[PDB]
Amino acid sequence: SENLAMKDETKVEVTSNNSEANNLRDGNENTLWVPGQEEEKSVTFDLSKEKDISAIDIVSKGNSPLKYSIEISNDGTEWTKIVDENNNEENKAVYSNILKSGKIGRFVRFNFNSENVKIGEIKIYKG
Ligand SMILES: [Ca+2]
């Protein structure tokens, strides 16, 4: 159902190329966020409040299989890594992940460790 990434109250921070940051949540899979060569390419969503998070899609437009992890937090200091695909070699257009029942968080952080990362969209579904 509802895509929290596109809620007005949701803010987004990126480790590079801030000019393209809103491309992560504009509802258009072909508008991309393409990070530069920083060692830790990362995106953090602040949902503004602690919310139910049921599922997450990452639309990956680059050539290489995406290597990534997903972390969540309530206070923004203590993080729980809920998906760890840093060694992934599977090549998919969309990397979907369904969360355990009852997962909540205010912050959702995405770390990308592959090459040619180009993210068309990140969708964070509440139930
Ligand atoms: Ca987009």
Numbering used by the authors: 1495 to 1621
What does the published report state?
Overall, the presence of at least three functional CBMs in CpGH89, with a fourth likely, imparts diversity in the ability of this enzyme to recognize carbohydrate substructures and potential for increased affinity through multivalent interactions.
CpGH89 (EC 3.2.1.50, CPF_0859), also referred to as AgnC, is a family 89 α-N-acetyl-d-glucosaminidase that has been shown to specifically release terminal α-linked GlcNAc from the disaccharide GlcNAc-α-1,4-Gal and demonstrated to liberate GlcNAc from crude class III porcine gastric mucin. Overall, the enzyme comprises a glycoside hydrolase family 89 (GH89) catalytic module, four FIVAR (found in various molecular architectures) modules, an unknown module, a C-terminal fibronectin type III-like (FN3-like) module, and six putative carbohydrate-binding modules (CBMs). CBMs are presently classified into over 60 amino acid sequenced based families; the CBMs from CpGH89 all belong to CBM family 32, which is one of the most diverse CBM families. Thus, CpGH89 possesses a complex multimodular architecture where the composite modules function together to efficiently act on components of mucin.
